[PDB]
């Protein structure tokens, strides 16, 4: 892996339950990728062109807690499994890839960067298999080309007997 990543936690359970109910987040936002949580799930959002994108099966139609109260989705597409909120200011916006590289890198919730071989518009194989438990909570995270540009957003693991051999992703064109 060429690209590197680290994470910073910003809230714990209590602030989270309360921030969900107020919809008001005063924390400073930073980073390309936001770690997100709702009552029942945990997932990621990738910032691209000033929009925070994530999976619909995680966010559904919910607002995002922001510094002025709840942020309404700017984009909701149930069939592509894709939603986007205007990025809070502070988020570092990435830029869509284009170059057509097929050496790809998935950023996970634990800030690991793993090598993916692009196989189709919305599919990739992992060069080494991983438990699927290791991928849980990373839906919405970025698939990057070697230059650090975004080709897509992770949607679903292709797996058997709890091991993931490939990933389904939403191509940056859909965005």
């Amino acid at each position: 892996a060429p690209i590197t990543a680290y994470s910073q936690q910003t809230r714990g359970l209590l602030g989270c339950i309360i921030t969900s109910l107020t919809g008001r987040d005063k924390n400073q936002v930073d980073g390309e990728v936001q770690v997100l949580s709702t009552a029942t799930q945990s997932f990621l959002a990738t910032c691209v062109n000033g929009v925070c994108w994530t999976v619909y099966h995680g966010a559904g139609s919910k607002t995002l807690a922001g510094p002025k109260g709840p942020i309404t989705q700017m984009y909701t597409n149930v069939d592509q499994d894709l939603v986007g909120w205007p990025a809070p200011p502070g988020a570092r916006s990435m830029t869509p890839c284009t170059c057509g590289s097929s050496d790809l890198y998935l950023v996970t919730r634990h800030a690991d960067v793993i090598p993916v071989r692009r196989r189709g518009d919305s599919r990739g194989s992992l060069l080494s298999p991983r438990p699927v438990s290791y991928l849980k909570g990373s839906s919405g995270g970025p698939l990057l080309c070697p230059s650090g540009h975004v080709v897509g957003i992770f949607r679903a693991a292709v797996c058997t007997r709890g091991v993931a051999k490939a990933v389904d992703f939403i191509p940056v064109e859909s965005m």
């Binding site: 910003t10 969900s20 009552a39 966010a59 995270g141």
Partner: peptide, 12 residues
Amino acid sequence: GSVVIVGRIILS
């Protein structure tokens, strides 16, 4: 309930 930002990944 709103979705909440509980952390962030810093890319480099």
